Structure formats: structure tokens, C-alpha cells
Design a protein around this ligand. Structure first.
Ligand SMILES: [Zn+2]
Ligand SMILES: [Zn+2]
Lengths: 425, 394
């Protein structure tokens, strides 16, 4: 009964991507689980379609150039498709509670609602303050986790609607293409140092050779480079001058292993740098190390209002790939176009990717060697939680829809290519 | 010896919410405890010693060499592979001999590694032992200013000091009443005039309009909305029918607020945010206030930190505020359409906030110190809310 528009990209169980119309019975799409979920039926038909998009200042790049930051968190579904949502629990006596509302069509739909119980003054203690404590203890989870057909979203009150959000899950699944490439290309620290160096190169490397820049003042980062380049058989050479007494050029010599990877893995294609898509479903440690390399190269870390890392890039291909990779780890990601710097040539626009996520981020930064980049690894084990995004629903015209049906009691959830968690009956 | 030693002029928060320089504190006096309760001063230790300045790495104070800094460092553990072994790196309390032979206790980054050809046995047991050897995610401890340089680079950078919210509450505002007033004052001192009880309100926001009216009525005041204050936007609001908000011709957020009733602080702050605040959800809830009046910037940073909020600043002054449930407890009192945000889901504690800092060895100078009742936690708050240590004494 629930379905998506033609072209909706779905993340398959093996990490590959597939358009919704092309998935067949027997195929396996990705569960938030990182585990597979067999498609048993493919519902078709026509129905009013609704568009879902994360509420952002973006939304444009769809058939134009890539300069415009696109909004990847989106998808179109039919009127009856159930949106996987979350609304925080709240108590101020006003509260958010699971309730019911008479739908126009006469359907009785369960939804979160704002309610209030006003009782006579002079007795406040056992009065209302009795509930607050009970509500605050009602649930360990600080949020409601339920679903709601797109057509029914408009039934929610102002406060609940504005506070309700959808989620995207990290990509827990892991292919091993990075390691596979190295092995078939003929040490245990191998993948790590390679991914890191690929990070440094993507951040500020020459598009034609295995060379990039490093902070000339950051002695520990240079040690790291020398060290890592060493583990791969690279007599890494440094050269003074790069930025009016700030950066330093690094030439990694040995065919060149680092350069062969750049090309072979697709970090360079048609002279344009980028973050190959496979990275999003590859070894998690590898994704983190690559990122740390990127952060050590052209990024910064702030912690005032929560640990946060920013990566700067003039390459649109790196921008979108980074966003995808960062979210594949379960990081919260934001993008902003700002004025660009000069080097000799003047670039108009630069992209700043902001990443946050507590321990998830800490697990990336603890691999950096950058003086101000590194942060100690998490204090304990941690879960890569689902991340929420506020969205806007827009009713559209009637159109063909394609949906999938998951196995009997499986959790009825799977991920779209953009990691958004969706429902399937 | 034995004491909490600060440079002359250091402002400490007293137990009644008032402020006093360190040199003016006398025995028997009571300074503010981080729990909002008093800490009696027993002795007034003084002398000469090398001084060190503490200043938030962009909150500041100057103490002497032996003064103990109240610090926290996160716990941390990680596996890694590397002539080839499994390595586990941890942050744990340890010992380090100082140049003067002194054995100083402090957090150290420790590495334990053994042959991969020996099984993951211990490697996983180590992390296991570490990830349960404590009931908390951080180390709470102290270290003399002069010993801070002993910390290894990694531990040093991850080590921070803290400031506590001001839990103590004065009924100065309530008493004067002869809440609703705090909110309006927030609007009043957020987009209002100066010479009259008139302020600006977004004409386009029934929610807010409803609020101003409803609240004015509860304070016996007609509505009054003479339109045209801003090019088809702000609709002037007059309220027909002291505390210090009106100061020196420019708007100013009173001092007493910081130590007044917490609900009153929040309400005034909600009124201020509804007035001209910008709340964002991006990477955690945050509220941004912009001002030209320094008296306001300073008054707001104080009031915000008093609640346990994390604050940043950025002529135009941009004051950024964050803090999860603490901030939510403020935004839920707002009426603004884009300002309001649901109140916390459960009970929340106004936790101490951390701040990274730079320490700089200065020159020998006089110092003024105090000691607290040996029966206390040996800690108190400076006027800037920083939690400092003072030795306990009989
Ligand atoms: Zn279902
Ligand atoms: Zn002591």
C-alpha cells in the first residue's frame, strides 16, 4: 500500500544502489540493521504523491550545474506510505502523548498530541507536580517512535508537527573493496595509512601527482606523514614554502602505490578529484581514517557548543561525496557555501561541510595527527545512533507508484540510497 | 601554604549572590558553593609566589603556583594494530616525576601492546577492565598550576576547567512585586525603545501577539499597537495603565538576575529571545542574540551561564547559547512561532560546563587566598562562576 515515485534510489543489502522500479522479488534491500531484508512483493498502482524534503536552505541542484548545494535527504511517496517518525517526549501541565484524531475520511489515526490537564490551585504539590515526575519516569526513551501516512501528517497540531522528524541510519554494513584493491595490487597498517594519505591528498593534493601540503608548524602531523608514507614504502620528501610561511609541500616517492590507488580507486577521474561512492559502504575504520586525513589536511575542529569538525573544499564532487561518507558513519552533517580563498587563482565559491555526532565524531578525530585536530577516542563503547532531520511534506499530483513489501515481522524498515529510514508493509 | 590563592582583585561569588574582591574577604565570610550553598572562610592565607593566569582558549583568573586547579579530562580507550602488535591506548590516573623531584599525580596517556600472535585475549580484557572501572565518562581531579605543563600533549589538550550554574536563588524580584513582568522586560530590552514602556513585536505572529496581550492584561495594561515602527514588519507596542534594566541610556540586563529566581531568569530570557532571538537546530539547539549594547552582551552572557547554558560571543555582538535541556527549558517559555521549542522530556540537572584554557606563567607577586571549613568540598565559585579549589582547614 505504501510506495515511492519512479526513480527513488534504494540502498541494497550488498551496499549497491538501485532504482525502485528495478528491484525484483527476491532482492534484498538494506535494513537499518546493516543486515539484509528480502523483498517479497512489489505493490504497484496510482495515487496522489507526496514529496518529502529535509527542511534546509538548499534544494535546487536537480538538472543544472553542481555549484548549488543539493539537499539529499528527500524522496517522493504515495499518500498512504507510512513515514518513519520521531517526536520528543515533553512535559511543562502540557505534555506530548500518543493519542487519536478523527481523520477526515473517518479513519481513526494514532498520532502524538499536545495535551494539558489544568487542576485547582492551592495544592500544587501532589497536584500537577505529581504527573510531571510520573511522565518524566514514564519512558526511558526521550522520544516517541511511531509512523504516519503522508496524507495524515496534516492532522498533527502545530507544536507536535514542528517537533516531529524523520531519520537516517548510519551504514553499518561493510564491503571490503579498499582492502581488496590493496591485496590484489600486491602490511596490517596498510589500509589505514593508505586511506589517511588519500585523505590528505583529497584535501590539498596536486591533481596530477602524489604530492600535497602539510602544516609546516605541526611537527606531529609531519611525523605522522613521514611515518605513514614509510609503512607504504614512500621516501616522503618535504619542501619549504606553500603559504606565506605556513604550509609545506610533500612529495611521496617510491609505479607509485599512493598514486596508483588515487587512480585505481577513483579518487581522481577525468582530472577531477572526488570521494568514490564505494567508500560509504566499505570498512568503517577506513572511512574514519580517510576523513581524519581530510580533516588534518584542510579542516578544523571546534568544541564550544559541542565537538564539531569542518572540512573545506572547492570541489563539488568532494563536497557531495564527503556528505554521503560523513553520514554513512552516522555523523550529523551540514553544508554551507561561503566565499573562497585565493592561492594564485581566484575561486568564487568554497564549500564548508560541518560534522557533529559526539562519539561518532570522536572516533574519527582520534585518528587525526593534527595538533588541534586530534581528540581522544570515546571513553567507552558507543552506538551509531539514527540521526533525525526536520522535513517538509508537499502534496503532489496523482502518479504511478512503486513499492516493496518486506518479510513477515522483520521490522518493516529499510534504507533509501540517501540513508533515510523508510517503512514498507 | 594550604589555601586557594588568587591575584588581588579576583572577584568571588559570595553565598548571598553578591560579589567581592578576594582581598576584601574576611574570616567568617561565606562564599558560594557550587551547590548554591555557603562555604565559610576560615583563614586568609597570603604571601608572595609565582603567579599563573588562566584564560579560556578562544572566563579567566590569576592564581599562584601551588593553587590547585579543578579539572576534568575525559576517560578514553581505543584498540589499534601496529614489530606487529595489538595496542590499547588509555587515559588513566598515573604518576609523573617533576623536574624538582616531586611525584605528581595526574592523568596520563598509557599504551599497552602485545604480539598479535598471542590472541586478542588481554587486549579485549583491558578495554573491558577500563570500560567499567569507573561510574563516569571523565576524571574529576586537581593539579597545581605549576604542574600543568607536566601533562602530555594529548591529555593536556583534553583537560578542562569548569564553571557551575548559579543554583542559589534570591527573591529580590518577587519581593519588589507591589514571571509575566520578566518576559515583557525581555521584549522591552530586546527590541524596545528606551524613554518609554514601548517595544517592537513581529506583527506577523499571532502567537506572540497573543502572548504580549495576555501578559499585559495580567499586569493591568492595555494592548496598544500603533502600527509602523519598521517597514511593514514591527508594529510598535505601548503599555499604558527601577530593577535596573534601564541603564545609562542603553539597554542593560541587570546583575541581580544571575542570582535571582531561576524561573524568572528563564522567562526574561524567553522574552528576550522572542524579541529578536534566532533559534537553530542544525547541530543541537542553539539560540542567537545580537546586540550593540555591551552592557547587554555582558549582562546576557552572565545570565545565560548562570542557568548552566554554554555561551559564545561574536558594533554588533552575537551571543550564542546552547545546552540541551537547559536551553529547552528556556525556549518552552517563548511564544515566538519559530522560537518556541518543546520543554525537556524528563528531569534534567544544570550540570557544570567545561571550558578549555591556556595557562601562562607570570611573575612573582602578592597573592590573596582563603581556606574553607575542612568539612566542605573545598570548592567555591568565582564571580565568573568558575569552580575553584581552596584547601580545607580547621
Ligand atoms: Zn508495518
Ligand atoms: Zn588543597
Amino acid at each position: 500500500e505504501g510506495a515511492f515515485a519512479k526513480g527513488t534510489n534504494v540502498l541494497m543489502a550488498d551496499g549497491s544502489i538501485e532504482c525502485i522500479e528495478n528491484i525484483e522479488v527476491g532482492n534484498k534491500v538494506m535494513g537499518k540493521d546493516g543486515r539484509p531484508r528480502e523483498v517479497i512483493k512489489l505493490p504497484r498502482g496510482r495515487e496522489t504523491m507526496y514529496s518529502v524534503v529535509q527542511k534546509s536552505q538548499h534544494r535546487a541542484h536537480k538538472s543544472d550545474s553542481s555549484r548549488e548545494v543539493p539537499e539529499l535527504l528527500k524522496f517522493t511517496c504515495n499518500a498512504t506510505h507510512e513515514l518513519v517518525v520521531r517526536t520528543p517526549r515533553s512535559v511543562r501541565v502540557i505534555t506530548f502523548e500518543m493519542g487519536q484524531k478523527k481523520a477526515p475520511d473517518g479513519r481513526i489515526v494514532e498520532l502524538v498530541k499536545e495535551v494539558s490537564k489544568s487542576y485547582p490551585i492551592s495544592e500544587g504539590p501532589e497536584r500537577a507536580n505529581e504527573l510531571v515526575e510520573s511522565y518524566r519516569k514514564a519512558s526511558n526513551k526521550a522520544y516517541f517512535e511511531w509512523t504516519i501516512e503522508a496524507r495524515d501528517l496534516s492532522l498533527l497540531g502545530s507544536h507536535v508537527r514542528k517537533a516531529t522528524y524523520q531519520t537516517y541510519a548510519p551504514i553499518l554494513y561493510e564491503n571490503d573493496h579498499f582492502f581488496d584493491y590493496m591485496q590484489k595490487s600486491k602490511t596490517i597498517e596498510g589500509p589505514k595509512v593508505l586511506a589517511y594519505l588519500l585523505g590528505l591528498w583529497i584535501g590539498d593534493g596536486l591533481s596530477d601527482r602524489a604530492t600535497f601540503s602539510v602544516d609546516s608548524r605541526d611537527t606531529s602531523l609531519m611525523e605522522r606523514v613521514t611515518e605513514y608514507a614509510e609503512k607504504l614504502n614512500l621516501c616522503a620528501e618535504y619542501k619549504d614554502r606553500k603559504e606565506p610561511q605556513v604550509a609545506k609541500t610533500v612529495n611521496l616517492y617510491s609505479e607509485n602505490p599512493l598514486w596508483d590507488a588515487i587512480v585505481g580507486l577513483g579518487f581522481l577521474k577525468d582530472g577531477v578529484k572526488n570521494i568514490p561512492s564505494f567508500l560509504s559502504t566499505d570498512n568503517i575504520g577506513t572511512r574514519e581514517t580517510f576523513l581524519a586525513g581530510l580533516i588534518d589536511s584542510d579542516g578544523y575542529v571546534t568544541d564550544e557548543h559541542g565537538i564539531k569538525a569542518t572540512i573545506k573544499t572547492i570541489h563539488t564532487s568532494v563536497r557531495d561525496g564527503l556528505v554521503s561518507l560523513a553520514r554513512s558513519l552516522g555523523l550529523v552533517v551540514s553544508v554551507n557555501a561561503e566565499p573562497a580563498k585565493v592561492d594564485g587563482t581566484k575561486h568564487k565559491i568554497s564549500y564548508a561541510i560541518y560534522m557533529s555526532g559526539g562519539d561518532v565524531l570522536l572516533n574519527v578525530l582520534s585518528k587525526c595527527a593534527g595538533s588541534k585536530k586530534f581528540r581522544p577516542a570515546p571513553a567507552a563503547a558507543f552506538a551509531r545512533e539514527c540521526r533525525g532531520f526536520y522535513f517538509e511534506l508537499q502534496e503532489l499530483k496523482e502518479d504511478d507508484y512503486y513499492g516493496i513489501t518486506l518479510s513477515d515481522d522483520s521490522d518493516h524498515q529499510f534504507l533509501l540510497a540517501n540513508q533515510v529510514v523508510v517503512h514498507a508493509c
